């Protein structure tokens, strides 16, 4: 008896998948962003002057 959202308000979010559909939309945002992928071996990742490699 001490819930702010009425019974109908909670049922609509529950039955209509309010958070899942929001979760889907945010994923779809990343579909229109530039991927981080680089193309090895045609490109290399950054290196630092302190890099420890071949003796």
């Amino acid at each position: 008896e001490e819930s702010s959202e009425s019974a109908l308000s909670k049922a609509t979010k529950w039955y209509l998948l309010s958070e899942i559909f929001r979760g889907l939309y945010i994923t779809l945002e990343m579909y229109f962003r530039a991927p981080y992928t680089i193309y090895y071996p045609f490109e290399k990742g950054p290196v630092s002057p302190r890099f420890r490699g071949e003796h």
Binding site: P41, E43, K44, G45, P46, V47, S48, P49
Partner: protein, 70 residues
């Protein structure tokens, strides 16, 4: 990837803003020995590097020598 010459190989890795063909002579490498063509990694081919021991055996055997009874 190993075909990339070592001088440029550092430039392709975003470690330097000065390409190796734009170096000032005070910074380059000056060698007393010839610098032949670049050679990549040679695995899976008969030119593969073979390790070996650079040191002679620590014990030297005796050379057979005979002098007869006086």
């Amino acid at each position: 990837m190993s075909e990339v010459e070592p001088g440029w190989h550092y430039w392709l890795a975003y470690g330097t803003d000065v390409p190796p063909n734009q170096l000032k002579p005070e910074e380059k490498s000056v060698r007393a020995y010839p610098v032949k063509k670049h050679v990549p990694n040679l695995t899976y081919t008969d030119g593969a590097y073979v390790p070996y021991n650079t040191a002679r055996p620590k014990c030297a055997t005796w050379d057979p020598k005979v002098t007869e009874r006086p």
